[PDB]
Amino acid sequence: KVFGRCELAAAMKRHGLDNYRGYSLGNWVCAAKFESNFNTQATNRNTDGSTDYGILQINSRWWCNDGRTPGSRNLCNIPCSALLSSDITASVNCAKKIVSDGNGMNAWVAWRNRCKGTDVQAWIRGCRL
Ligand code: NA
Ligand SMILES: [Rh+]
């Protein structure tokens, strides 16, 4: 599923990401835009052989099982395919564990490089929230 900007903002707010660990909704929308272009089906292989999955490009090295990332963890206790669903519940619940683990949203390379220190509230401007 390819979300609209305001559709994804509403879905993320309903699932508890607005101000989660102090990160305003626009931070999450910005991260999703540059990680996945708001596409739940996005996948990208990493040099180490892990893969990033879904609208927030969550990595099989630590967070999910994809059956082909040897010596990896499954800290969100999910198959990586759950992160590709039109339903963002798995991605959101797994993102809450990631952002809670000490590095905050710096875990998302696209957030650090394209969203951090920018006017992220622009990402929810004009949305009915
Ligand atoms: Na894994
Ligand atoms: Rh939902």
Strand content of the residues, in percent?
5-15%
Major sheet: order of its strands?
1-2-3
Q: What is the CATH class?
A: Mainly Alpha
Sum up the overall morphology in one term: globular
Label the CATH architecture.
Answer: Orthogonal Bundle
Largest sheet: 3 strands, antiparallel
Number of helices: 4
Distance, first to last CA:
21 Å
Distinct small molecules bound, one entry per kind: sodium ion, Rhodium
Q: What is the structural class?
A: mainly alpha
Radius of gyration, whole Å: 14 Å
Number of strands: 3
CATH names the topology as Lysozyme
Q: Which range best describes the helical content: under 10%, 10-25%, 25-40%, 40-55%, 55-70% or over 70%?
A: 25-40%
Number of domain modules: 1
User: H/E order of the elements?
Assistant: HHEEEHH
Subcellular location: Secreted
InterPro entries: Glyco_hydro_22, Glyco_hydro_22_CS, Glyco_hydro_22_lys, Lysozyme-like_dom_sf
Domain C-type lysozyme: 1-129
Main location: secreted
